Amino acid sequence: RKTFLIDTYKHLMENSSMIFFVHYNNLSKTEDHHFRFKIKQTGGKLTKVRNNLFEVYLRNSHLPDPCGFVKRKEQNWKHPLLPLLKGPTATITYEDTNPQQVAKLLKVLQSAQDKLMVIGAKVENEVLNVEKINTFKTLPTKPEMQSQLVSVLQMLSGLGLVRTL
Amino acid sequence: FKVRTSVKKFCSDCYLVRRKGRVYIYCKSNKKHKQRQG
């Protein structure tokens, strides 16, 4: 299918930081609302993610958005982990990786962590390993900045030039 | 400089250069790896 819905999948793997991604099946509706609230804090909505076209979306990187014409079968397999999810996945329109943003999301996630199924770390801006995700959790990105898009970004104007005489 | 007919790059930090009609092998790490083709 792909089309616009795979564009929402692209929204999950955009810029900025902090992502969600959890199995749609067995997802507490109260927790789901709280997850939506967590994305609403930065502005956004939960987006359902299904496989078959999700693997196609992951297959093509920085390429023209695929649509119904594009077929999962017509695309080559090779990478066997192309479908990261094992079924229906409900993920808020979150961004990349940020411990500060995920902290609140984790609190909601931890409450019903048994019910939902988290998505394993998938290489995004940097290589992400599901097996080594423990190390990635212990060593995440620097969350010193919280403004992200607003301010900082490119208007941070950091004139480091010479700092040692 | 080791001036010689054979001029192979030893380590990964070695790099081959073509100047003055001569193959030079300079190196960023080990200074012993400097060579010149004749």
Binding site: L161, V162, L165 | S29
Partner: protein, 196 residues
């Protein structure tokens, strides 16, 4: 090719023009040739400076988004393709210089190793372990300043010229391995040997 294809961003204060030379010169290789006709200029706040360039190259100035592109008449021609990546990079460097300015910090390392502005900026005297006095005149465009005696700064609009000058300055005493000792241009490093 991959470099030359990258489009150059311009801020309204800076203007990248192009026009034919007064007396075009031709570089003659063994088989191939290269006729220098056009003359690109990069005028801006800090200064203005130019690049003499071949005929096959030409700009593509767009009004929208401040982008300009550079292309050659034949990318499959090897020499042209090689030139293309150079010229684009050169004009980017010029843009950077005119808007921001190029910089070259030299830190002196050693007992009594230091620089001094002798002729009111026009001659960088350098004292680096020599009975005879050492130094050289600053070129036109280059402005030198010394925050400390042991830490000199060279500044200019041309990235080529400033960094050449810095290299020349260093050449009086490059860093020794045994003691990290000499003249270090920008982020320069040296693997120190064991004393023994």
């Amino acid at each position: 090719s991959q470099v030359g294809s990258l489009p150059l961003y311009i801020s309204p204060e800076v203007q990248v023009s192009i026009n034919a030379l007064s007396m075009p010169r031709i570089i003659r290789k063994g088989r191939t040739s290269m006729n220098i006709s056009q003359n690109i200029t990069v005028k801006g706040p800090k200064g203005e400076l130019s690049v003499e360039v071949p005929d096959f190259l030409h700009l593509d100035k767009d009004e929208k988004h401040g982008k300009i592109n550079v292309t050659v008449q034949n990318s499959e021609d090897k020499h042209q393709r090689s030139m293309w990546g150079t010229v684009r990079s050169l004009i980017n460097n010029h843009i950077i210089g005119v808007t921001e300015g190029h910089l070259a910090v030299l830190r002196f390392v050693g007992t009594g190793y230091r620089a001094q502005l002798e002729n009111d900026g026009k001659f960088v005297n350098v004292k680096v372990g020599a009975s005879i006095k050492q130094g050289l005149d600053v070129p036109e465009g280059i402005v030198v300043k010394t925050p400390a005696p042991t830490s000199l700064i060279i500044e200019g609009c041309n990235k080529q010229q400033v960094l050449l000058f810095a290299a020349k300055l260093r050449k009086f005493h490059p860093p020794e391995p045994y003691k990290g000792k000499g003249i270090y241009v920008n982020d320069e490093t040296i693997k120190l040997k064991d004393k023994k």
